[PDB]
Amino acid sequence: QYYIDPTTGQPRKNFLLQSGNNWIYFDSDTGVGTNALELQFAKGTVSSNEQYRNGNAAYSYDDKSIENVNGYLTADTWYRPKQILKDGTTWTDSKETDMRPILMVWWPNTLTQAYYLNYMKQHGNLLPSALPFFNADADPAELNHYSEIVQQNIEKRISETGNTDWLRTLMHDFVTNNPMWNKDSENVNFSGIQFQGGFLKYENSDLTPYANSDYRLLGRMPINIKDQTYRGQEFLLANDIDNSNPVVQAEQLNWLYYLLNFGTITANNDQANFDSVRVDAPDNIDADLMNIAQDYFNAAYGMDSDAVSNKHINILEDWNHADPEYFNKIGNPQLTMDDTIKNSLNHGLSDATNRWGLDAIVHQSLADRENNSTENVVIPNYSFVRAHDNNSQDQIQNAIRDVTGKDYHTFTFEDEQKGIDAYIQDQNSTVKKYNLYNIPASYAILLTNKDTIPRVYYGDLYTDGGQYMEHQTRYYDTLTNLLKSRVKYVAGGQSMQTMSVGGNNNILTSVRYGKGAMTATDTGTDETRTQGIGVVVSNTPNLKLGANDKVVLHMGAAHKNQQYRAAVLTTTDGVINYTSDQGAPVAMTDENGDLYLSSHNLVVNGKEEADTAVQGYANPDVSGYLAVWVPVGASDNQDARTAPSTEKNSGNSAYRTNAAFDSNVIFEAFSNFVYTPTKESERANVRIAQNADFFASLGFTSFEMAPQYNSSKDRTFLDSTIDNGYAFTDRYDLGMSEPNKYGTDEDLRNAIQALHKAGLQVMADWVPDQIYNLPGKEVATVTRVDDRGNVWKDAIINNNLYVVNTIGGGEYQKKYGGAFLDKLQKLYPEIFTKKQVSTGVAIDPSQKITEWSAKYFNGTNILHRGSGYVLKADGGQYYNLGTTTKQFLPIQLTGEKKQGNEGFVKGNDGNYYFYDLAGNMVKNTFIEDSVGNWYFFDQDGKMVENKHFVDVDSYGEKGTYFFLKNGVSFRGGLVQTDNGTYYFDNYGKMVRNQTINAGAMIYTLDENGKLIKASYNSD
């Protein structure tokens, strides 16, 4: 029963002996000999490979174990396995911190698993560099083989470095490479208003009850409230706030109260409150918010008196041409802009080529100013030449783009400064490429215009770049003079005329009569004789008046035989200004009251009179001609402005367009490209407080401030790169958590208070459209759309699940969110009862928005996460922990394969086959079982049981093996045949041409495998 070794004396353990026709194998434990021909194949034998199924399965189904968003799984998912291959060798029970990538064990298809291996080989070095790339034809079992080795190598590197930080860098880099999980499947398009690459629209679904909303009305601009006309562009930037939702509508009213009472809310201050608001993107939001803002302003401020209304002058950013109508119909709660004068001035004077006829300035506007002598007749409006977002934002950016070649997507301060340098040099040039022509000429018309409030842009007084008021522009001296002249002289009716002498409808005459006179035939009151103004402007630099042609300033019957001094004159190099009466060239009117100018110079008692002749000029200041004439003998303290009436208005409008309305001037007190201060003294709001009286000196009554909200600094759009204040995370944060680009909340309060003491209004930039960069993640059902909201051409993210950044808001959003709705409902109950048009129902204060979510948003900008970023199964079923939808996880995390496969299977005639964890028939591979037996499967996957010396190639293992009739490869022992005794090492490989030391014995072997000499040796 036992073979006992002659040399050692011990019974032979693990020994095979041939005796004629019989083969006897001796036991490895004791040495009991049984017939090797009758060796049984194990009945319920399982592979050591199935130890992975036990370990790689998830620890549990909790937030702690498996990382999840809203319930679902993502491509960048770490999970907690049951066991860890510590150093890629030993299975160990996982701790709470042991987190592994889901893509290490799971793949959506075999193709991406092949792409996984190729990426982890090249960029990861977790596979041999000599190993070839895996194609689409690669064997699924072979792909499973190498991917399992990658796990071993991953765990090896973790045991060496002690980090998992390199993994999150490597796995995220892999995710972004596939067209499944990046911007490739996003349909990235920059059509029109799609600044950030396009938009995704949130939709109601069973899969995401969080994303559900009964409202979400799109394109509800002022013209399209009732949805009667065409719907506008609802989506603009970042996370588009749903303003159809009455819960949000109440929150917007709550936020409006916060801005209008800021000083009281934060520091119990009285004079540190905003008096008016600027509606940011009115044509992009649900225009219900206009009526809500109207309802509050009529109830809290009670705007039915000219004296009360003109102390709170609200304005709109309505670029729509049909908007002045609607806002006039609803009673002008906020002032509509006059885009028509802007077009008439820009295309008439500012254009580089093919200027408009200057008839446009006269006729094309909300007020025809040819013979305007009537009051309270036109739509109350504000007008401007340039703004922060208009006629600058794109040009300045182009200057940076030309000098350095960079977008707002990374340029640094240095490259921003280089662009500004080129922009200001261009500004101070005769031929301009980025700057508008005839700025002083444009402003000379604007500030002398009747039936409109003018708005002076910051970038026209101070440089668009630099620190706040660090540098003054070229046009500073002229505009400041014109603004001071407006206070003294500009009043009464207006008269305008055009000549066709040089070009076609060039050369314009602009005349104001002064307080007391409306028409030309009006003789005027007492004050009229020194009031009024005369402006001559031409747009052609080629202008050469005829020897007989004369330009006439018809000052009217009020100014018969008066003396007029020069205020602004055009020279060959630039312009000359005169602030006082002394030093200025003088001109006289006739019996009719006409100031004659011609091709020849003016003459007083035999004098040349400086530069007084009307002719075409070409210099950095004027590309045409400019002249401003002013009556002499004016008081030092003269004020042409008329006081607002305290009478109750019988009409149904918030603002009347009288002369007292014309007394106001708005200052847009910022450019988008102001530099972020380094010193405390370089802060914008500190300097506004210091120069508070100076802003009154120019005649500014309404002071439009920059949006004081803290920037997101995400560099997704321009508003977050230079930090305007239009790109914010926290709506209620006004330099409170950290100082913004303009200063702290204390600096802001000081600025507002100083302006109130100087006798000015202060405007809050109300931005109810979007919220930038939110910290929390959420899964919502989306649809790829355009700016208006229409489904994209061939949208591949149509009704797909997507991870969006909607959760968040900030500290002060959580503090003041809906915190004033309780007081507002008690104070003014009429606001909360009024049924909103478009919504159908009134605003809803019952829910306070302290934290934002997908419910309160209409949509989002494209996020480049991928259309298949939310993990779904092979046949299209989204993986979930059971929170939102039915619990479903992959076969890897549960850890139980079931089909006609896995482990060892006997298939009728085909002997024994092996199927791996996935269920693929394995060929040319050695498979070790749970106990420690290696079985080989040939080129057909059939188990070998020959008992003959068979050569195997396998996975780079060139060697000769021996297979018993049970299926096990013989290893670590001797086989005695009729040809001699043969030895096989611990791996089943036959030892040849070597003297080896096995146990207590030493075996010498030749090039045939036969034993030469077996000897015992100790010590």
Ligand SMILES: [Ca+2]
């Ligand atoms: Ca919107």
